[PDB]
Symmetry: D3
Subunit: 257 residues, 6 copies
C-alpha cells in the first residue's frame, strides 16, 4: 500500500516534502521525525548512487513513521531505474520529460509486463530488497499497482506538450522545478519572469484539467504557501542543506547581536 | 588463463555456480571456499558498482581457490563494460541480448582492436587492475584470448533470433533466466507455463546445435538437477541470500519443534 | 518504547532464539530480520563491526518492521565503546570476558545514567544521538535506564567460580555461556564436550536457575541447540549467519552433483 | 598555519562561537564551513566519527578556505586515539571527563613532542602523516607543539572540586563545561538550572577567570548562549547541526500549514 | 579563486605539467597536491572513481591550499555524468573520444548555463550543490561559466580527420592526444611509434598551433614527456600516480639489494 | 599455510626487505604486492587503518598471489585490538612501545590461543573468523599459534635498558627499532644521528645478535637501508609508500622541466 500514490490520486490536501541533498543516513533518519508527508532522495543533482539510496531508504524506514520516500533518478536509463526499484523505492521522479513518448517510456520502465500493462519493461529478480530478499514470492502480483511515477516538466518543449504528457496513463504527478524551467526558457536565475510564470501556470492548469496532481519545488515557506493557495499539491519546502545553513546562520546572528 | 572459458569450450561437464546478490566482501570470500566452479557478482539486480566489483574480485582471489568470477554488467554501455574489464573481470554476462547485432556489439566492447578482432572497441589503458597496474607487460597481446562473453536471452525477440545470436563469433555461452523470460512472455512469476518451457527448450537446442554452452538460473536443487539432465552446462544453484534465508529459517523450526 | 527482549528475559520462562551476525552486511541483516528469530546479535568482538557498521545494521534490521530484537556484543568493557553502542540505539548489550562480580557491576554502571535507582551510573549524557531520536525523544534521559538490558558472558574458570555472585549482581539480566572460549580457558581448547567443560557449563546454568536469571548459550548446531533448550537454557543462539551460509551452499552443491 | 583558535583563546577577550558536528557528514561539514562560525567540533565521543571520518571532515572544512577552526573531541584519553586525531591534522583537541590535575597534565603530554619546553611530551613522531603534510612540512617538529590547543571538559563533581588545580595545569588552553553531564553527576539528571548545578558552573567560570584560562560551554539555544556570553564565557557552542536541522524544518512545516 | 588552468591554456607558450590520479585515494591526492604539478587528473573513465570519490578527491586536493588545478575525465558524454562532475565542483573537464565538431560543441554546451554569453547552454540548475558553495555563493549562476574549461580527447581516425573543425569549436580549450588509444584505433595496438600514428599525432598538434589552441598529451615516462615538450605540446601528463609508485619502490629495492 | 616471514626471521641470516603502507589504499596495496618485497606493513598506529581497512588491504595483497608477507602494526597492546588484527588474518603483528620483558610476554600471550604449547595464551576464541577461512578451517584453533609471529618495537630509554630481557622473552621473533621515536624519547627529537641515539641502537642490535633474535629497523632512504644491512639489521623497512610516491613524482617533474 503506497500511501503517497493513494493520496496523489485520491486526495485534495497538500503533501509537504523535504529535498534530501546531503546524502547522509543520519540526516535522513532525523528528518523522518520532522512530520513531512514525503522525503526526496535526489540522484540527479546530489551524489547519491545505488548503495546510498538503499542506505537512506533503510534509515527512513527505521524511524517507523509515515513519511514516504521519493527517489529522483538521474536519467531515464533502464539500468538506473532498475536499481532504484530493486532498492525498494516505490515512488520515482524522472527529470527532463519533454514528450508524451518520454513519459510513456518512463512508465513502461516501472511496469512488469501484465494484461494491466502489456508493453512493460520492468525486470524480474526475486532476491532483491523490494521482494523482501525472496520472502514475498507474492511480490510480482501486487507491485505494479503500488509504483508511483512523477514526471518533471522543465523545458519549453515539455510545457508545449504538457497536456499529452498529463494524459499518459501511469503519470501520477507533474512536477515543476522553477529554476530549471526558468533557465531553459532563457531566463536563468529569474523564476518570476512572466514567461516563466506563464509556463508554470500552464503546467498547473494541465494537471487540473487531466485530474493529475501537480508538484513544485519551493525555495522558502512564503513561496510554498503561495503555491498551496494556487492549487499545487506535492509541495517541496526546500532542502535539508538549505534549512541547515539558514538556521545555523540565524542562530549565530542572534547570539552576536 | 581463464579456465571457465576453456571448460565452456572443450568440456561437456556441467559448471556449477552461485549468485552473489548481497554485495558483501566477506560473503564473497567465504563462498570462494564452498567448492563452486563459478561465482557471479551481479551489477544489474544488485547494487554493485565499480569499487564493489573490484573489492569482491579481490576477496574471491584472496581465497586462492578455483572459483572463476563472472560479472553481469548493468547494461551494454561502453563505460560500464570498460569499468568491469579494467577491474579484472574476464568473464562478462550481458543482460537483454535480443539480436545478433546486440551480441556482436557486446563482443566488440570486450576486444582490443587486433588482427583477430579488427573491429574491437575495448579502450586501452595500461595502468589498470586487469594489467596488474602495468606489471603484465604483454597485457595488450594476451588479453583478448582470456575474455569470455555470456549473452542472456530473456525476451521473445531474443528467443526468435537465438540461432543467429548463437552463431555470433565470440559468444561463449547463452544464458537463460527463466523468471525474466516468463515476464517478457506474459507469464509473470510462472516459469512452469508451457510457452515459457518451449522458449527455454529452444535456447538450449540452439546452443547444442552451435556448439555453444547453455547456462541457466535455478531457484532450487531439484530444478538444477532437471537442468543438468536436460543438457544445460553453466548452472546457477540459486543465490547467496536465498540459501542464507532457507537454512536459517529451517534451523529455527527444527530447534523449536 | 519497550525493550521486549529485556521484559521476556526477566519475566518469562520461554526460550528466546537468536542468530549471530558475523558477515557485517546491511543486506544480510535486513534479510535475516525476516527469518523469525527473537533476537539478532551484531558482534563487535569477533567481527569487524565498528560504530558506523553497528548503526547501519541496526537501521537495516529496523527497516524490516518485524519483531527481532537486536543485541550488540561490544569488543571490551571500555566506557567509550559502550557509549558508542548505546548512543547508536542498541538497548541490549553483551559484555565479553566477565569474570568477577566487580566486572559485572562495572558493566552495568557503564549502561546507566546517574539516577535514584542507579546513583553510581556512568553513562554520559548527550540528547542529540540516534538513541534519543536525535533530540525528538524529549524524556530520553528519564526513560532510557529502564529499557537497557545487560548480558554478561561467563567464559573463564575464575568467572565460573564467581558465577553465583555474578548472577546476584543487580542489573545482570542474563548469563551467557560461550562454550568454545570456556573450553579454552579451562585448558580444553577445541573440546567443548570434555567433562570438566560440561561441569563448568552445568554450574553456570544452575546458578542462573537458582538466582532467577536467564541463561544463554551459543549453539554450534541444531542438535546442540535442542539439548540446551531441553536443559533449560533460555537465550539460545542457533549458530551464525556465515556458518549457515557455508553449510547450506555446500549441501546444495553436493545434492545437485549426486 | 597558525592555529588562530589557540591564538585568540590565549590573547583575546572576545567570544568564539561554535557549532557541534554530530551528523558525520562531509557535505554538512563543508557547507557549515561557510556559515561564519569561529569553530566547528567533530565529535568522536557522542557521535560515530572514527579516524577516516575525522580526516574526511577535516578535509571538507579545509576545502572551503574560510576561517572556521576545527575542534576534535576525542572519545577518551587513550594514547592511540589521541595519536589518530593529531596525525589526521586536528590541532585543537577536546578531552572529555577530565577530573584531576593529573588527568589534565596527561592529556597535555599526549599532544606534545618531547622537547625542551615539554620534556615529558609523549607525542609520537611519524613524518609521513597528514599533519606533517606527508613529509613535505619540513619544520613540523619545531612548529607543531606551539600550534596544538588542549580543551578540558569539566563535567563531574570531582572535576569541579579540583577545577582550580586543573586550571593551573600548564598547557590547558580552555576549560569547557558540559552542563548536561555535570547536572547528571551532581544528582540532577535533566535539570541544568538546579541551583547546585548553577553554583558548580559558576565555580568553573571563576576558576578560569582567575587562572587567565578561557572558559567554554555547550548551549542548547540562543537565549542561553547569550546569557553565557554576558556571564563571561568565551568558547560558546551554539547547539548542534542536527538540532538546528530538525528545529528549522519542523518550524517551516508549521508555517506552511498554518 | 579563478580557474588558472583555463586562463593559462587560453594564452602563451608555457608547458603545463600534470599527473594522472588512478589510485582513487584521498590521501594520495592530497599528498600529490604538494608535488608542484600544474594540474592533477581524477580519471573516471579508466579508474573506478564515481561521484562521491570525485568529490572526496577534489576536497582532498583543495585542503592542501596549493596551486594545482584538478581536471576530471568523465566516463562518457552522458548528460547525467557531466552534471555529477560539475555539481561536485570540477571546473575543468576532459571528454573522451570526441570525433566530430558536433561532439565537441555538445560537450561544451553541457558545461554552460544558458545565458547571454552562451544562449545554447544545457547545464542544469541546482542551487544547493557543492559547486555553488551549497547556496552560499550568491552570484554563482552569473560567474560559473567563465571559469569552466573543456578538454576534448582526440583518439580516433575520424577525430584526426575532423581536427581542424574540432579546434575551431568555440569553448574547446585544449585538444588532448592519448597515443595508446589513437594507435589502437589506427590499427596499431601497442605501437605508438608506427609512422601512421606519429603522422596522426603531428596533425593534431599542427592544427592546435595554427589555431592557437593548446594541445595536450599523455606521456608514460620522462623521456617521452621531454620529447613532447620539445615538439610543442603544452598540457603534458607526466605519467600516473601508480606508475611512479611502482617504479620508485622497485628501483629502491634494487638499490638496497645490489 | 606457512608464515614464511616467521620462519625466515627465526632461522635465516638473510635480510628481509619491506615497505610501510601508510596510504590506506587497496589499489596501492595490490600494486605494491607486485614490487618484490619480502614484507608489507599495514600500519594501524600512525595511519588511519581500522579493522575493515586491514581486512581490505590483506585481501588486496593476497589477490596478487605473490610472495610478500603482510605485517600489521597494532595501535596498542589492548586485547580487543589484537583480536581484530588476528581475526582479520594478519599472521605477523608489530607492537609499539614495548618497554619491559613483562610488556613483551603480555603481547606474545595476547597472540596465542591457550594450548599445551602455550598454556598461558590469552587470545579469545572464535572459529568463524576470516583467519579461520570463515569456519572451513576446522582445526584453526588447534593449529593457529604455530604461524603467528611477534615483532616488538623498542623506542624508549626504558626499553633499551631492558632490551636483553625483552629479547630473551619466548615468542619474541624480532626487535624493531624506530629511530625517530627512539631519538625523541632520549631527548634528541629530530636528531637520529646523536651519539646517545646511535649508542642505544647499537645496544638493541647487539642484544638481538646475542639472543639469536632478528633485529629490524625503519630506514628513510636506500643509503640508510644499505648502512643498516651492513651493520647487521635483518628486517629492514625501505621507507614508505607515500614517501616514494612524492620523491618519484617530484623527481619526474624536475627532470622534465630542466
Amino acid at each position: 500500500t503506497n500511501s503517497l500514490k493513494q493520496r496523489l490520486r485520491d486526495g485534495d490536501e497538500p503533501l509537504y516534502g523535504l529535498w534530501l541533498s546531503l546524502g547522509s543516513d543520519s540526516a535522513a533518519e532525523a528528518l523522518a521525525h520532522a512530520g513531512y508527508d514525503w522525503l526526496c532522495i535526489d540522484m540527479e543533482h546530489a551524489p547519491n548512487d545505488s548503495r546510498d539510496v538503499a542506505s537512506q531508504l533503510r534509515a527512513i524506514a527505521a524511524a517507523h513513521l509515515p513519511s514516504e520516500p521519493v527517489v529522483r533518478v538521474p536519467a531515464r536509463e533502464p539500468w538506473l531505474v532498475k536499481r532504484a526499484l530493486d532498492a525498494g523505492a516505490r515512488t520515482l521522479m524522472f527529470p527532463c520529460i519533454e514528450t508524451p513518448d518520454d513519459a510513456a517510456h518512463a512508465v513502461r520502465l516501472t511496469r512488469f509486463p501484465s494484461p494491466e500493462s502489456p508493453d512493460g519493461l520492468r525486470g524480474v529478480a526475486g532476491m532483491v530488497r523490494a521482494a523482501a530478499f525472496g520472502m514475498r514470492r507474492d511480490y510480482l502480483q501486487t507491485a505494479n499497482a503500488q509504483v508511483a511515477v512523477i514526471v518533471q516538466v522543465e523545458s519549453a518543449r515539455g510545457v508545449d506538450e504538457v497536456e499529452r504528457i498529463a494524459a499518459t496513463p501511469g503519470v501520477d504527478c507533474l512536477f515543476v522545478g522553477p529554476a530549471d524551467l526558468a533557465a531553459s526558457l532563457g531566463h536563468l536565475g529569474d523564476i518570476r519572469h512572466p514567461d516563466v510564470e506563464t509556463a508554470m501556470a500552464r503546467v498547473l492548469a494541465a494537471g487540473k484539467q487531466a485530474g493529475v496532481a501537480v508538484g513544485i519545488f519551493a525555495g522558502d515557506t512564503a513561496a510554498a504557501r503561495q503555491y498551496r493557495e494556487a492549487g499545487y499539491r506535492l509541495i517541496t519546502v526546500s532542502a535539508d542543506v538549505s534549512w541547515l545553513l539558514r538556521a545555523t546562520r540565524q542562530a549565530l546572528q542572534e547570539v552576536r547581536s
